[PDB]
Symmetry: D2
Subunit: 222 residues, 4 copies
């Protein structure tokens, strides 16, 4: 197709200019160097993670999937984390959610989308859990709200995995973070508190949901 | 942590900048136009997909796992595939691997790493499959060849999932591609041919493997 | 190895006997006629499904896992469901839990058991949902009780899967069940009501838990 | 429903008979006797493992799935295997396939069976692998030979898993076995040699495929 032509045109034009102006980017990239972070994000990738963070030299290890899940028994994501932590010694894992998320809106409104429906039932579980709180917000905001709550519930799932409990138990330098951003200004919010140990997991969980499930039904980013 | 603090600073520096400078970017985000391409890429993410393609405008729906696999029965990938095609109506799927892939190395070398070993045994299957051709080149170049063979096998698997089969059986326009690059130039190389139907799958498969498993045992991208 | 030699001798003696005695047992099985029930039970298999149902001539198509789960994204269990319904068009799917379940006990007390822990965090979700009722419950009966809720929760998961919804939509004949039992009498107990379409899914779920989370705080099978 | 009514009555009569007859059955199960064998068999359950082996007294720990898989990254089977070895401490894990397997034939037949085709794509990779030997075989006997071949393959996967590899490494005596049987007789047959450590793994794999891929293209169970 001509668009596939166009993509290789863009690559060719890019490769040429970077190898000319900043060859150092490529030669240091071709080194083995460990990334420093693990970024669990949505497949939507609305603002790419490098853009949001300013990390332009292969420093993120990245996992993506729909609505940025750390499902208890998804071996794909679980393997990402274990390879990240145990092998590449990342000392930071980041679950990032975002507003205007296709999956999160499906988890609430329950549309017939095919096979993807099953995956979103995990997020629907959390919808159902927090449904009294949700049903008090303008219907235009309820999805974005559950995207915040979705992040927090996934940081808790990641913290409770065997991959994190072992790493913590052996005394390894790992900590976990929830972020969210909105589509107005693409600026990250930090949800909850530092979580660098097993003992601080339950507190983060609470604090993040204390922050999110605020008494005044206000979204954090808009 | 100061390193995390740097990310939030970077993020504010960046955000408020794009506002002053090109505030329509976020205005452009709002509309929420469907992505045209599903990119299935490595968690390594050496050079990010946006950079390699020039797609900085939301054209990309993105999934990543260790060693960019389409494992037959991975409901993580399969779902992103199903959603991007059936729902978002993407008309292209790209499996992109890259040279210098650690997951691929470990699959050849078979060292003990913990959990990740199970995930990689899938690529170790492709190692054992093509090992006669592989062992015939210098040991330093074997994992880059399996990074290529990997792309060709994972693409054939994508073509063979019920998701792609069912899309093509109903006449929806969707196609699939294997890309690969070396880290020294970040230049894309296409694997095989055009696959816009179930008819094309066996054809794309053997011709990619023709270019890859070439008479001269040459690496495509360095 | 003695105990392994032992199984070839039990088998050997068994085969010949029912071969001589009911050759019609086998020539019927030979005709791989469609099974009539799919049975999803625990790996524990405390009493066999054949003995609980008295059905000994291939009638049950059978899936087993630790604590008899229907996990939204479990493609092992979904694929058995789907093949049994779409290909073997079974009419009854049954989820059978049991008192004194190792996996269930671990999902309450939270021992550090290895990879299996990731699996039971799904069971731990349900514990945490009804932790108020379970704490008021006597400590020594906590496990068997949650095993009851667990049936009802998995049954709900079953009906909600893309498999049960599609067939119930296209009006295929099929229904779902929650059975539980104790190991003092092996007497199948019913958890729920009839559910042969999408319409009654909600009542079934709502009646099982009311019977399970009974004010009497009593077990239903001892 | 009439047939459902029947199972509860079958259940009741059975419970009646055993208690008022041989109450030592319940007395013994009510205690904590850990099973010694993991049987990984097929959902078809053409002849129950309990009958096949003569182990009617809780000795068996059972997983089943379609065409009895040990998929590298199936966390269902892997969660049952890890629990069985690490927590219940079984000394024998058995993979048992069978002649006349609906999953295995449909791997070759490649019909449009739904979700199951993805789970079945694993089987078919052995059909493609071994097809040359298989096509020298009669067009009736290919599926039964592949059935044998798959046991040989899934057994390989099992031995290769981190779970069996970390068990063998820490000084545990656990061993693996591959059985098949035909339906004429339910007569079990061994495929390979004793695999009770890591070094033994490749030989057993090779011996089974030697005994299975024999030069006279003959079946083993009829
Ligand atoms: Zn999203
Ligand atoms: Zn890689
Ligand atoms: Zn159990
Ligand atoms: Zn079978």
């Amino acid at each position: 197709m001509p668009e596939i032509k166009q993509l290789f045109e863009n690559n060719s034009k890019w490769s040429a200019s970077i190898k000319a102006e900043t060859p150092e980017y490529f030669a240091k990239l071709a080194k083995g160097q460990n990334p420093d972070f693990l970024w669990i994000g949505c497949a939507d990738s609305r603002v790419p993670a490098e853009r949001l963070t300013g990390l332009y030299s292969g420093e993120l290890f990245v996992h993506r999937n729909v609505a940025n899940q750390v499902i208890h028994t998804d071996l794909n994501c679980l393997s990402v984390v274990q390879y990240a932590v145990d092998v590449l010694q990342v000392k930071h894992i980041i679950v990032c959610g975002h507003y205007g998320c296709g999956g999160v809106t499906a988890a609430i409104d329950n549309p017939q989308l095919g096979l993807i429906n099953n995956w979103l039932l995990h997020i629907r579980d959390y919808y159902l859990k927090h449904r009294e709180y949700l049903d008090k917000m303008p219907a235009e905001d309820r999805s974005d709200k559950l995207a915040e709550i979705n992040v927090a519930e996934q940081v808790y799932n990641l913290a409770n995995s065997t991959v994190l409990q072992n790493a913590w138990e052996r005394g390894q330098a790992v900590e976990v973070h929830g972020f969210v951003y909105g589509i107005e200004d693409g600026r990250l919010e930090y949800l909850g508190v530092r979580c660098a140990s097993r003992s601080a997991v339950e507190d983060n969980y609470h604090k993040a949901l204390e922050k999110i499930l605020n008494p005044n039904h206000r979204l954090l980013c808009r």
